[PDB]
Curated annotation (Swiss-Prot), chain B:
(6R)-L-erythro-5,6,7,8-tetrahydrobiopterin binds at S36, V370, W371, F384. Isoform N-NOS-1 is expressed in brain and colorectum. Found in the Auerbach's plexus of the enteric nervous system. Isoform PNNOS is expressed in the penis, urethra, prostate, and skeletal muscle, and coexists with the cerebellar nnos in the pelvic plexus, bladder and liver, and is detectable in the cerebellum. L-arginine binds at Q171, W280, Y281, E285. Produces nitric oxide (NO) which is a messenger molecule with diverse functions throughout the body. In the brain and peripheral nervous system, NO displays many properties of a neurotransmitter. Inhibitory transmitter for non-adrenergic and non-cholinergic nerves in the colorectum. Probably has nitrosylase activity and mediates cysteine S-nitrosylation of cytoplasmic target proteins such SRR. Inhibitory transmitter for non-adrenergic and non-cholinergic nerves in the colorectum. Belongs to the NOS family. Heme b binds at C108, Y399. The chain holds residues 299 to 718 of 1429 of the full protein. Signal peptide: none annotated. This is Nitric oxide synthase 1. Ubiquitinated; mediated by STUB1/CHIP in the presence of Hsp70 and Hsp40 (in vitro). It is found in: Cell membrane, Sarcolemma; Cell projection, Dendritic spine. The PDZ domain participates in protein-protein interaction, and is responsible for targeting nNos to synaptic membranes. Mediates interaction with VAC14. Homodimer. Interacts with DLG4 (via N-terminal tandem pair of PDZ domains); the interaction possibly being prevented by the association between NOS1 and CAPON. Forms a ternary complex with CAPON and RASD1. Forms a ternary complex with CAPON and SYN1. Interacts with ZDHHC23. Interacts with NOSIP; which may impair its synaptic location. Interacts with HTR4. Interacts with SLC6A4. Interacts with VAC14.
Length: 407, 411
């Protein structure tokens, strides 16, 4: 019931009590751990509302006050009559910030209270969605001095009128399977690109074509919009020492912005809620560039470095990996686009954990995602025991809409 | 039931049924995952089902389930348990059990090897001196002048828990650590507490950076006794770098034989509290953890200094660059001296093939991702992208507390 987490580098032990407030299920049982699996009515709603409103009124030091009891009363009345309820602005803001605070896979949460919340609940059409999203993109980008933001579209009603952004991120590159058998662009995005073309997009057919948005308002068929090119800040990738690096023709975008997740606050479901921060360098340099199923660039880079690729034991993959990651960080920093390295981010997270343990009684953290995909044990998070559990408000994965949607 | 694991690089999906045979707990519940927690005297009544599960598993493995041999063995074991409160394994059952505890070790990336294990039966041992001899023989056999062979040496099982065999060393070969009055540590900081124990017990400490610790051995619940492994049996590798001539002057070396000596082997309900086992190293164990952990030899700074890297900001990735060079050096050094070692790319690739084989022939392969993924270059190894299921099968190796925390001193 009361649980200890130990840091094996520093011997610091912290005690977790926050997990007792956990609500949802983990995927694990006493017989099987699923820690490494990527995807493990009126009646239901009033408890969820009450749970949330209690935590909110507690946060503003007015728990069990008349304003507390009056709002619980009001939400209760409203669910009774209408089958749902509407969050106050103060509650929506609190809820969005806490969904981020509770996101166990996010190493960037020291920042959680500084989130700019854009209330797009008054949106009704796909053109409106497009407008809201351009404004989000411009605000968050801020000419390279990035600011965290979320834009929240209307909540689910009967579920036949869902707002969705069909894109997985606001900004992503097209992928095209070629006669050649190879893939041009991002292999992650082949299926979505086909949907875009099939819906009428005219693809430039290059290696870094920013995808159009596919927006679904009010459960209608999604429509296509292109983000103003001038709002998408991109960074050409060069290396501080290797002059040939630029010749690889690599670039990435400045703004990481997840658009396929579902935000749950007080039992209400916000199925379109694009959110953004800034990159940790490894995300681009290790994963986007070096995953065999992605741009898969290790081979080309190692060749330009003139390394012995004959045997795995020469660690050519590892050498080229480091360089690619030095290049990414240098390029963002030179163009003054906000980026964080995995050493600084993980150090920040350890501090955030201590804060959360001290002020909140714990911090749900998923070690499998928090530990960077390179140089794991030379980051402090590797040595830090973490407990993973699900608190609400939360961000949840949801299925790609082309499976749900009836055209 | 059926559980599926996906590999996100290949889209290959595997189906686990083996997890239905799991019994012990994981630490996890439907409300909390403890997948990153390092650490998440039997009665007769408990013992006969444990013996029976094991014997049914053994007899099935030799295609003799339900034979007269199988039935007669169950009867014989049952009678021994009710008569003596315990039982003895046949040599064949002991071998099978030891191999299976390895096959079942979910934190072990080297399991493709599991069926090649030399088992030394040391159940006739009675004294610390006897244990010393057995362990010397294990070291010499496993070392094989650099052509390393996996092995385990199994000392007598637990009886009343007051007569335990234990190796107090956590590994058979490890280096001393000495806390200095000024707060610095000489040698390996992981081994300071044990080093102080050896010293107190009468060890004459050379007080250098790589002093091989003496063995501290407990037989039959007695106070443990000190013994020095003959130095000519302890194979070591001086670490040098293929391109950097100054790497040798760091004065680094490491031992060739990784040999765990503090774990408990459970077979059919019986508990083998002293069961030292050894394989060969994966390079990162030394180059990443032993050399570069802040709490271990902590060489990153010195290496990066010598390399003249920009050390004013982490974003130059100086630590990452030094890290790779050190690991190249370890692999090169072991290879040049013809001492078995495997790189983390080779080891993980073989583990995936092993895992897929097991899913096909066994219905599963319990694996702990947190431990299986290497501590450098995680996602450029195939295991990073492989979903895994962790659960506990027996026979098994288990952690046990250090014996100095529990021992009743006789004086
Ligand atoms: C401000 C700087 C931020 C940093 C440096 C950061 C860092 C990260 C990183 C490295 C990941 C792993 C991404 C991956 O492997 O694909 C992640 C995941 C995540 N973060 Fe953040 N984060 C930031 C801001 C945010 C914000 C603003 C939110 C929400 C408001 C958020 C919620 C999440 C969620 C839900 C995930 C898991 C995503 C998934 O399941 O695919 N983070 N964070
Ligand atoms: C044959 C070559 C082998 C290789 C390359 C290898 C590889 C590894 C590695 C890298 C670890 C993680 C070490 C760490 O982080 O501390 C490990 C853990 C382990 N392996 Fe092996 N292994 C080998 C043989 C063996 C043998 C012979 C056994 C027993 C018969 C064994 C049982 C284990 C166990 C029980 C662990 C978990 C240790 C603990 O919890 O402290 N492995 N293996
Ligand atoms: C807000 C934010 C900040 C930041 N620094 N990075 C991000 C990364 C977003 C992202 C980019 N590319 C891929 C992903 C995820 C996989 N790593 C997508 C994903 C896939 C699956 C199967 C499950 C899941 N939960 N999430 C997430 C978001
Ligand atoms: C048979 C074998 C082969 C191989 N390649 N490597 C090994 C490494 C053994 C080892 C060496 N140094 C430390 C450890 C473990 C953690 N890494 C010790 C440990 C500590 C704790 C707190 C728990 C635990 N289960 N195990 C294990 C053994
Ligand atoms: C199977 C495994 O869970 C999967 O490859 C994970 C591992 N850790 C990760 N960690 C982060 N931050 N992001 C990821 O996409 C993944 N992928
Ligand atoms: C806290 C965390 O579980 C701990 O640092 C683990 C992580 N993964 C590991 N993996 C291996 N192979 N060996 C270890 O000692 C550890 N330590
Ligand atoms: Zn778990």
């Amino acid at each position: 019931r009361f649980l200890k987490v130990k840091n094996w580098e520093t011997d610091v032990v912290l005690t977790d009590t926050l997990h007792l407030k956990s609500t949802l299920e983990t995927g694990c049982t006493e017989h099987i751990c699923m820690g490494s699996i990527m995807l493990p009515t009126k009646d239901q709603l009033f408890p969820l509302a009450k749970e949330f409103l209690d935590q909110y009124y507690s946060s503003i030091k007015r728990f069990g006050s008349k304003a507390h009891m009056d709002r619980l009363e009001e939400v209760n009345k409203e669910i009774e009559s209408t089958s749902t309820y509407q969050l106050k602005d103060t509650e929506l803001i609190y809820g969005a910030k806490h969904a981020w605070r509770n996101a166990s896979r996010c190493v960037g949460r020291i920042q959680w209270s500084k989130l700019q919340v854009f209330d797009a609940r008054d949106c009704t059409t796909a053109h409106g969605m497009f407008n809201y999203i351009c404004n989000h993109v411009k605000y968050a980008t801020n000419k390279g001095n990035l600011r965290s933001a979320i834009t929240i579209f209307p909540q689910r009603t009967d579920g036949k009128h869902d707002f969705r952004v069909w894109n997985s991120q606001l900004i992503r590159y097209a992928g095209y399977k070629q006669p050649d058998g190879s893939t041009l662009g991002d292999p992650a995005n082949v299926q979505f690109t086909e949907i875009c073309i099939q819906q009428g997009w005219k693809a430039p057919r290059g290696r870094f074509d920013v995808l159009p948005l596919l927006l679904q308002a009010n459960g209608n068929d999604p429509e296509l919009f292109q983000i103003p090119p001038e709002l998408v800040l991109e960074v050409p990738i060069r290396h501080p020492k290797f002059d040939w690096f630029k010749d690889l023709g690599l670039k990435w975008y400045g703004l990481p912005a997840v658009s396929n997740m579902l935000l749950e606050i007080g039992g209400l479901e916000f199925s379109a809620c694009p959110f953004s921060g800034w990159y940790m360098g490894t995300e681009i340099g290790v994963r986007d560039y070096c995953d065999n199923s992605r741009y898969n660039i290790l081979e080309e880079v190692a060749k330009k470095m003139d390394l012995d690729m004959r045997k795995t034991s020469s660690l050519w993959k590892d050498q080229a990996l480091v360089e690619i990651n030095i290049a990414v960080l240098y390029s963002f920093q030179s163009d003054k686009v906000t980026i964080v390295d995995h050493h600084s981010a993980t150090e920040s997270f350890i501090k955030h954990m201590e804060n959360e343990y001290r002020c909140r009684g714990g911090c749900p953290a998923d070690w499998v995602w928090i530990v960077p995909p390179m140089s794991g044990s030379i980051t402090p998070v590797f040595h830090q025991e973490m407990l993973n559990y699900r608190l609400t408000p939360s961000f949840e994965y949801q299925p790609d809409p082309w499976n749900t949607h009836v055209w």
